[PDB]
Amino acid sequence: PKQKTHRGLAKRVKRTGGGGLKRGRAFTSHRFHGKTKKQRRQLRKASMVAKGDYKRIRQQLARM
Amino acid sequence: ENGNDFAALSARNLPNVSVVTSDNVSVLDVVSANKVLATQTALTQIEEVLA
């Protein structure tokens, strides 16, 4: 039978055109009065793939 | 060629001879043999399918 892709990563990660993946940062949906104002600016913007976690995840997101 | 029923009913010979019509010519029927006899019209009906 076919593989089944993960439905936790399809709702969190979208694939770019160069090969990598776009990722949305964390620590954004909670208390903010603890955090500073440089932090809450610099945690709006998306980051890329670290090549450690691209190994074990690659086969799950086989087509999406 | 086609129903040459008086020329196809005379090939239950020695194993020198195996006989294929103009449609069922495969690869193993040809590569195994050493020479091929063929009529004129069989060559034309080969050159229709094989363009």
């Binding site: 993960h6 936790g8 990563l9 709702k11 969190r12 979208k14 990722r23 949305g24 940062r25 964390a26 954004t28 949906s29 976690d53 074990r56 995840i57 086969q59 799950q60 | 590569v31 195994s32």
Partner: protein
């Protein structure tokens, strides 16, 4: 070449049979080493498991939605047109009909990369704001039908 045969060079490997004596290199535990659950029968954890550490997908947040009525097109840029020399009515038929646009998706859009020197005529369903200028520079005619 007859029945009594040669493959191409490098065309066909052999195999590697595992667990057949201690001088092939894979006898006594078969390339698995000592104990542990990577070395039992049918062991190994599921994919993406990292111990009880919360894995990467339960660490970063869910985001977005999908439109139900997304209508995206079947882009041809501009150089693909540059072999229909003069006067064709480029269209969602005869344009395709040689191996150009199989499976139009929602009608054909045209883009502007990168040089057209003909006098064609185009019938598509959308156009960029530079492909019209590139076509009318070369003296053609366009219509969004």
């Amino acid at each position: 070449m007859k029945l009594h045969l040669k493959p191409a060079e490098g065309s066909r490997q052999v195999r590697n049979r595992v667990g057949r004596g201690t001088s092939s290199g894979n006898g006594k535990t078969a390339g698995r080493g000592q104990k542990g659950q990577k070395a039992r029968s049918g062991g190994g954890v599921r994919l993406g498991f990292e111990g009880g550490q919360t894995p990467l997908f339960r660490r970063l947040p869910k985001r977005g939605f999908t439109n139900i009525n997304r209508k995206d097109y079947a882009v041809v840029n501009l150089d693909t047109l540059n072999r229909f020399e003069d006067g064709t009515e480029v269209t969602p038929v005869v344009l395709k009909e040689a191996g150009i646009v199989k499976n139009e998706k929602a009608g054909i859009k045209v883009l502007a990369d990168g040089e057209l020197t003909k006098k064609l005529t185009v019938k598509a369903a959308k156009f960029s704001k530079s492909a019209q200028e590139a076509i009318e520079a070369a003296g053609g005619s366009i219509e969004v039908i």
